[PDB]
Amino acid sequence: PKEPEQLRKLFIGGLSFETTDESLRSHFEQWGTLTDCVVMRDPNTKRSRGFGFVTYATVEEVDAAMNARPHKVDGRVVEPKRAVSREDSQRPGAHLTVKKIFVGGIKEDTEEHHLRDYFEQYGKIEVIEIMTDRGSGKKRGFAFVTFDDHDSVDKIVIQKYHTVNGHNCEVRKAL
Ligand SMILES: CC(=O)Nc1ccccc1O
Fold this sequence. Notes:
Layout: E1 9-13, H1 21-28, E2 34-41, E3 48-56, H2 59-67, E4 72-73, E5 76-77, E6 79-82, E7 100-104, H3 112-119, E8 125-132, E9 139-147, H4 150-158, E10 163-164, E11 167-168, E12 170-173
The chain binds N-(2-hydroxyphenyl)acetamide (9KS).
Residues 82, 84-88, 95-96, 154, 157-158 line the site of N-(2-hydroxyphenyl)acetamide (9KS).
Domain RRM: 8-91, 99-175
Region (Globular A domain): 1-88
Protein name: Heterogeneous nuclear ribonucleoprotein A1
């Protein structure tokens, strides 16, 4: 069946105030079937709030849209982000826009190439830090991976599971 709708939505910030439901749809339909497309407006003035959202039919279409960034919509470069699927209890509905993940549960036998070979298919990697003990140099069993862009992290933390070097890993957004 269909992927959950929350995982098919893109919040689009930085809209031109002239962008409409129709012009936002004409732009983003280039990368897939849109089941929803709305510009947020003031309830009294109808003036744009400067953001909106689009819902694609599939997650692959969301990927296609994010891979086609930067998006210039009605003359303005906009800021698409996947919808918050797991929120911070203290900042409900806020996207924590970061480029770095914590990867835990990798034990002492996981090396840099294990992490790179796995995570490079989510995005362009800039830093891999396998954490070692300050006193002994022994591996501590966790790592940080820094990407060049936040959408890689968003794709990663949406997954229920990550298997790296045969280990079932815990992955979360970092700093
Ligand atoms: C807190 C936060 O930024 N959550 C989030 C955002 C995008 C995709 C998945 C997520 O869990």
